[PDB]
Structure 1
Amino acid sequence: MTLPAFKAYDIRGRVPDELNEDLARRIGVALAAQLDQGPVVLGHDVRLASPALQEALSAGLRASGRDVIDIGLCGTEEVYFQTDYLKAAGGVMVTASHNPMDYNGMKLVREQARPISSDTGLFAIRDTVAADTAAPGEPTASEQSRTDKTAYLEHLLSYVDRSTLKPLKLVVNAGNGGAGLIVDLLAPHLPFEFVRVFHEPDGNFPNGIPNPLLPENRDATAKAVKDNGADFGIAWDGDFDRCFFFDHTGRFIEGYYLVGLLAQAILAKQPGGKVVHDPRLTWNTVEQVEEAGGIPVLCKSGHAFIKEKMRSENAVYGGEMSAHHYFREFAYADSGMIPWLLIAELVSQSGRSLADLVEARMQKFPCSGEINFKVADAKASVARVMEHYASLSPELDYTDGISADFGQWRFNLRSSNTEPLLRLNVETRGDAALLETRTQEISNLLRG
């Protein structure tokens, strides 16, 4: 066996059998052997065990001669930002993001907040931790507390012209994660009126775990928007590296359409830039990037692949349909804060509602949304789909699973890299009927 908590992109497991303070301390020791010279930034989310897991991680790091910069209770993107800003050797965010309350985990980065993933150091760390039976050493390095968010807040605000912002009314739903702390620190500098839902950090999660995809968290944001006549609503997951938008009618906006929207917003500030996008849903992003003078760059989905493609291309912005938005000036890292600041600026400057900014795009490229399948035999199921459509001779692309372009419609079908599931995405050229019949047809073949 191997330690189950070590996944493709991060560490995540149930406390205390899959992850605990002893493992966390051993991970700190193993991490110190993987990084270049320098201190290590540590931060944590609102979960009840997160401070103790961070303290054990710090004890292992300092036993191995690493200075620790403790940035405290924060979002995942603040570990990214400070690791790069403070020119640290690496950083660790203690978080389970959006998972149940008996779970925790870690997200690990090296210099410039470059991700540490299964094939780029994480499984080396796993195997070291798995074999480590050494007595815990004592600290030969210090911990400094640096909770000042000023540089982070100034960086977030640098993405918008504050003199162009209008006093929009914005619903904000932290889900009792950590997003509300940053909202409240930004608010004195912004003209918006905030309608705060589930705002207080509470790792007991009295209102449900912080996953805005659950229709119950979704309904709380939508109800707040409609009941207050808000311009739009924003919800985050627990560590707020993901943000989700609700228009003025309470309608949840499919993340696909935010990629094209944000790309156009960014390309207005950085003309001619490259924009990285994933292969699941593409046509709208390609068109909107090109219309704004940008250059679209196809990349396999998954944050390590997006970030690495962005670096190699000097891309100004990258976006995934799964509510991950990455920014070159932000150490090529994802933020759940920059996106809504950019959208609020767009609404303020254009005089258009978020609903109408995306309405015509949704009509032009309707999509199924991501549909997940747990089947007995994924490989045979995929083969059944491809054999069925073979006689239509689609254009096939293997960047990330299978992409099949039939002309007026296309689909992407891939295996998940974080769960054992098939994921389906379908889109069409302005044809909702074709979208439904092809989506149902593929769903039937997969389930066969």
Structure 2
Amino acid sequence: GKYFGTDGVRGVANSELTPELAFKVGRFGGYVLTKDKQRPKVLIGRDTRISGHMLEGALVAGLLSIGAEVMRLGVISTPGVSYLTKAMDAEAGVMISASHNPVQDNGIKFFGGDGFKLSDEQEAEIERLMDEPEDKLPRPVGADLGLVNDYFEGGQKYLQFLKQTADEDFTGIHVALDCANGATSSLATHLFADLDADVSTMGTSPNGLNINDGVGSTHPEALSAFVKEKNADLGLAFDGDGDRLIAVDEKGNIVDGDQIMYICSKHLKSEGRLKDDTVVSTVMSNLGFYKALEKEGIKSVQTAVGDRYVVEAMKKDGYNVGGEQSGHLIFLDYNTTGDGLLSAIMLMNTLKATGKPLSELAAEMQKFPQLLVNVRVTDKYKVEENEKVKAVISEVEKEMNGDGRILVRPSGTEPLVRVMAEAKTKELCDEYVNRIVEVVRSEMG
């Protein structure tokens, strides 16, 4: 009924996301794409998950059973697929991965020919075919059967395109890489060695079991240690499929996606390349990122959470740069989806154009402290309105006067509500939250 969430088709591999489903996906999916060509060119990529092989085989089988021309890519980052499908006029690109999730999980994600996600009505038709119980789709025979020519060389192409967006050799910079034991493990090390940086690596020994196991964008603490240990200029932590980037300065502090977006968009404005000097972001972004934008004369468009809205916003009005705090950054001049390595190169560009250390460049955006307090309440759903709670909030907001932010949303999992403040100091956070919290306890408990 719905197999395509916001990440395409996800599940625990073999339990929920069965090789049986990956076959029907590939078989019906290639049908929906058979309205263009009747030999649609389709690219498959995967990350280093052990189940990728089981799913790639079953999925490739379905694509060849309706006549699609299949191009195995091997293990490559999701950006690589997006770039490659558009750069080789393919009708689609599939990526088998579950990003930063644990190893038992896998997923199937589709790209149409433009390098963006598959159109929402195309995904619709697929789902409507997978709920009929009788496959009456064609079964080509003999030479009408699908044909496979592998392209394990495609990584080298994507690599050479990234290398061409480097403004100059990164000589003299000692960089440390955490590749999450995932899709970027071989790509990243070849990319930065080839730009003549000094490269120390970790999380680059994938074996099908160890993806995002205390490594990668979402477990940056290890890379923090490894940078201080090897006295590196910075650390780069991609996630399992290479669409996120989180950095680490020479002093070992985490540099999140808000700060990277700041650092780079300010670099692009400095070169005339940021278009309309605007930057698209989500509501997930820290208040002091907007503050830092106004102080550098960069307008901002804010959207709802989710890659699809950030990219839709940039597309409508020609925007050059977008991103979320998670490390997902889109440089629409170069690639149609978030690209960890691309982010990394723009970051390195800034490091060598300004000669400053990454500590200093991340300083120029002051993050506002946040504070969460969880109030157990009897019925968490009748606080949306309340003359005493909704009042104390509006009071607290205008008092802040744009140098702070409130958010109160009932938990879904549990019988409690989450009160969260951003302010310019931890102490303003404490009081602002405690005002709202103590009147919430006045009703429920």
Bin of the TM-score, shorter chain as denominator length: 0.7 to 0.9
Residue 313 of structure 1: aligned partner: 317
Contact conserved, 1:271 with 1:294, CA < 8 A, in 2? no
Residue 25 of structure 1: aligned partner: 23
Contact conserved, 1:10 with 1:122, CA < 8 A, in 2? no
- After superposing the two structures, state which structure 1 stretch, 287-296 or 71-80, moved more: 287-296
1:105 is displaced (CA, Å) by 0.7
Q: Which of 428, 431, 434 does residue 434 from structure 1 map onto?
A: 428
Q: Which of 249, 267, 270 does residue 268 from structure 1 map onto?
A: 270
Residue 70 of structure 1: aligned partner: 72
% of aligned pairs identical? 23
Kindly provide the amino acid, as one letter, of the partner of residue 237 in structure 1: D
Cα 1:441–1:6 change in 2 (3 A) is farther
Residue 159 of structure 1: aligned partner: 165
Kindly provide the amino acid, as one letter, of the partner of residue 387 in structure 1: K
1:37-436 to structure 2, matched below 5 A, reads 37=36, 38-116=40-118, 120-122=121-123, 124-134=125-135, 137=139, 140-148=145-153, 149-163=155-169, 165-205=170-210, 208=213, 212-214=217-219, 218-269=220-271, 270-273=273-276, 274-281=278-285, 283-290=287-294, 292=296, 294-362=298-366, 365-368=367-370, 379-380=381-382, 387=390, 389-392=392-395, 394=397, 406-411=401-406, 426-428=421-423, 430-436=424-430
Contact conserved, 1:276 with 1:317, CA < 8 A, in 2? yes
Between the aligned partners of 2:410 and 2:161, the Cα distance in structure 1 is: 36
The answer for unaligned runs of 5 or more in structure 2 is none
Instruction: Give the RMSD, CA atoms, in angstroms.
Output: 3.5
1:12 is displaced (CA, Å) by 1.0
TM-score between both structures, scaled by the size of structure 1: 0.83
Between the aligned partners of 1:219 and 1:91, the Cα distance in structure 2 is: 33
Cα 1:254–1:150 change in 2 (3 A) is closer
- After superposing the two structures, state which structure 1 stretch, 267-276 or 127-136, moved more: 127-136
Contact conserved, 2:282 with 2:302, CA < 8 A, in 1? yes
Cα 1:272–1:239 change in 2 (3 A) is closer
Contact conserved, 1:98 with 1:210, CA < 8 A, in 2? no
1:132 is displaced (CA, Å) by 4.5
1:318 is displaced (CA, Å) by 0.5
Between the aligned partners of 1:240 and 1:120, the Cα distance in structure 2 is: 27
Between the aligned partners of 1:170 and 1:64, the Cα distance in structure 2 is: 46
Cα 1:373–1:262 change in 2 (3 A) is farther
The answer for unaligned runs of 5 or more in structure 1 is 396-403
Cα 1:411–1:82 change in 2 (3 A) is farther
Contact conserved, 2:203 with 2:215, CA < 8 A, in 1? no
Contact conserved, 2:112 with 2:118, CA < 8 A, in 1? yes
The structure with more radius of gyration? 2
- After superposing the two structures, state which structure 1 stretch, 250-259 or 334-343, moved more: 250-259
Between the aligned partners of 1:130 and 1:371, the Cα distance in structure 2 is: 45
CA deviation string 1:67-119 (max 9, x = no partner): 222211111111111121112222110001122222111121212122238x5
TM-score between both structures, scaled by the size of structure 2: 0.84
Contact conserved, 1:272 with 1:294, CA < 8 A, in 2? no
